[PDB]
Symmetry: D2
Subunit: 283 residues, 4 copies
Amino acid sequence: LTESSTSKFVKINEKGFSDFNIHYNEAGNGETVIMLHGGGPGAGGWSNYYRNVGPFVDAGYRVILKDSPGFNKSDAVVMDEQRGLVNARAVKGLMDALDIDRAHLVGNSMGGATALNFALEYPDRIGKLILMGPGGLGPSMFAPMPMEGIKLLFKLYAEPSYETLKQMLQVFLYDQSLITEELLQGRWEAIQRQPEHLKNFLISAQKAPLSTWDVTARLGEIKAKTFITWGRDDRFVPLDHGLKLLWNIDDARLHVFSKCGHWAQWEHADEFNRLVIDFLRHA
Amino acid sequence: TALTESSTSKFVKINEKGFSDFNIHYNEAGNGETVIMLHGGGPGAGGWSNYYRNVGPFVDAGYRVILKDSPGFNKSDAVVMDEQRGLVNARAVKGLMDALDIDRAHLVGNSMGGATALNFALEYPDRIGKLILMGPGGLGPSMFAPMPMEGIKLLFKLYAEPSYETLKQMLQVFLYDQSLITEELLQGRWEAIQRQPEHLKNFLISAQKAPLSTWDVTARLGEIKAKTFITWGRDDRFVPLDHGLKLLWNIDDARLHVFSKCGHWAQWEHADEFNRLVIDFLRHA
Amino acid sequence: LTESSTSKFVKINEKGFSDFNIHYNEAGNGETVIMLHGGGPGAGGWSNYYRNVGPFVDAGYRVILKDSPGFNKSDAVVMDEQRGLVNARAVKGLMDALDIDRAHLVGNSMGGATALNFALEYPDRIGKLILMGPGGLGPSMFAPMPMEGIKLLFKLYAEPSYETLKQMLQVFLYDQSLITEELLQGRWEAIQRQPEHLKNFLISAQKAPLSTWDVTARLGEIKAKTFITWGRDDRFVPLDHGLKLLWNIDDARLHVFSKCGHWAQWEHADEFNRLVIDFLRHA
Amino acid sequence: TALTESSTSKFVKINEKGFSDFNIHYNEAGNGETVIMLHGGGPGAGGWSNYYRNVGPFVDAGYRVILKDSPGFNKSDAVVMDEQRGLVNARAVKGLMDALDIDRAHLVGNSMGGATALNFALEYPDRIGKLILMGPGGLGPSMFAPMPMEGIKLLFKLYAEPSYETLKQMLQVFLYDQSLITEELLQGRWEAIQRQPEHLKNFLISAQKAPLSTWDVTARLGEIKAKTFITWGRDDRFVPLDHGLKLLWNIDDARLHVFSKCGHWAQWEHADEFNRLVIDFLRHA
């Protein structure tokens, strides 16, 4: 499987979306599993889950790596509401235009916020819920905020540069040796590729700061089976939020990887894949 | 042969520091890599009672499974210990391995058994494979839970004043869903208490000689190089959830899994999930 | 100062209150400080703050030890709403009939929930906010619930007895030697004195379980200077809620006493008094 | 005499384990019970710089205040240490007390100074009065914060590549309200770095000989009998808030106070509150 071989597009229509073009990568048959990427500059479906797409399709699943509105190859956009909620509406739209009643969700950071919102708004359209360091869960009980990674994230959005990108990555990953010239230059080009997304993201932040993302109060509503994962060494989202989800979502479980940053499905792809696939198959 | 408590029941004499021709009872089945499961420290605890929902699946997965009765518990010989139990128990595990010609073994440890497993990993690093901890005890104070915790108070109350009712109360506190307690579970455990009364008295004499605080091996966790899998019940009223974090941060290569709607016994209350997760860990980690 | 010498009554009129008689103990002149008791059987204004009333009045404060509706000498009542909110309405009523525009609040357990609700509903009628192991803050991130103390609390309400009372007290206090025959028999008589309160409390619990008490979502609204105290060894309310309040209430501080149960103002009266009086005078 | 940095500036030669006629600089004023305040470990740290917002109020409250410059910092003599700094610094505090005929002293310690105070309480229990800890360092891993923390990364970066800009960045990370940084605070600290460059190099050589991990005295906290007051900034990006809990649970008689909207320096960013709380503790605890 490759980026282009799975590259596809589709227009959607929802509350705040009218003939909006959404990009994504598809492969495999069976139950549908929609993986949602984070909110960092240059983020995208394939770039974030290219190490999970293969194993999951083999496991007999229909994998869809979706590009959220205002990211990668999906159309640009400015949001007046918390991205979590808006992103979820975009998800429903993609499954409607594509005719998909049920879908398993896998979401990291912004993707996790999106997944949480989707489960709250459309509980009848979601299968199992998988969260990897989801964002927008309010204050941490131990970590000063904004967290290290968040400060670098906004810094990168407001003042894009190779240097700042690297600094963000060094804080993004636990094992510094994983930061290669290929990875650096790779995402570097992605950011410069579509600057409009960077500015639009910042404008949206103005309209809806992270505080409008906190859906903690509605966690008791989610009834979908949930699997929470966290990198023990995540400098972007607080580890204690993993406990928050574990205690407030009726049926959930928590798995924490050691020597792991904010990119668990990538830094510990093998264990992540085995765990989630096992979770989807037997849970 | 059918796999039952009786069909798997065996005994072996061990020799090690503090042990001379000491009889250890255990339940064994299967062939392949060795997995020794170590039980908790409550009155009436034993290998079979702790792990009867796990032995079958592990054997079927291709492992040689040994459910060991630690010294001073169930069918193993009686003893009054003057040293911390985790260390003494660890010496017993080595003694059993030596006696059965087992070079290396994966360890699964619950509570006292978890402390035992940690001591084993520290004292005999070349004799252990992977390390599985299920709510290990003796790791010192909690950063959030007042101590002694509910489960510990009932454990000591049962040791001093054994009764069927107090046993039921302790089991209830150790669970998330108290309705899961069966008449058969209670009866089996009550019989273990009634039929080996000396173990309760000896445990208390031992506890006075070596308080639970002497079980704390936190300071040496950084020495453990065995790949470790830590499991905890989100609703454990016996040992503190934050100790799972303590282990996750201090042991070099570990991962932590917390089960929701689960009391202290993750291996029992969430047996299927526990079995799948641990077997996957042993096979692919 | 004594119980009777400060014993007083007063009728109030609020949303769910019409000519409702509220009891309390008063002494001293100056700024008004209203202390609210916990929700355990036999609880009451004087019985819970008799070690703090003296020092505070001397500090130049007008101290009012209020009996919440359905407790001690105040009229009986059955609530259909979370007690925190109802209790706050009773507080406003007491200050209205008594003509008190501003008041400093000191609340333990149920009293803390009451204080939080009052600050949220009537922010223009509160001075400084002092919380001591306040209840109704949702799930704990570490403590299994119901907590040890809560189980004994309900056990005592449903099946009143000398034995259960003692067991509750042993879990209520850190230092077991403080449990004397005088204290035991003392509160024992108080409980049996008015059984109607016990049954009414249980009925109210049916109408509004602890889940309707969680006002966490509105903590960001409180602007009153807040002082949070917690017993390190509290087996009734989770220590991590102290951090919850510290992070969500704009201007707060946290003090944790070691070797201390769920009755901080009593178990560590001297330090508690110095700290809070200093807080009221200089904060 | 007016109380200024210069008017309080003094020097004393000390003799102790590892010290022979070693010159220690300190700032002193007041009379009464002795309170020795120990500074943090960042480049340019010193007694006056750490505590100039506290010395006046403490002296006015009736205490003899000594703001000590630890070995290898500010105006005290240079040194390359091969043992953990907290212990070596503690020996220096005793040396200073012996040289000045001070029998017992209350200690206030920030960061490295907090580690120093803990070591002092452990090694010389009969020479300490009350113990005040303000964000003490070297207490091992955090149960929640990834390490090294932001403040630690900047501290080591400044030690290796000193610059005014990196100094400002470090100070910003150590505060909650970054706008509180003044030109005078930065200039004073920058001068301490520029005028004693050897301290930065010696600190790094010392750190290689005795990593921060050797500073961890967690295992002995139960030995401390001094009444202890632990203070922490809720927004400390240098040392973890949960270590405040660690101290609260392991030290026999302690209390914990956490300031909101406060970075690492509770004594500086919330000076008035800190002064009132600590003075009340020394007087009535």
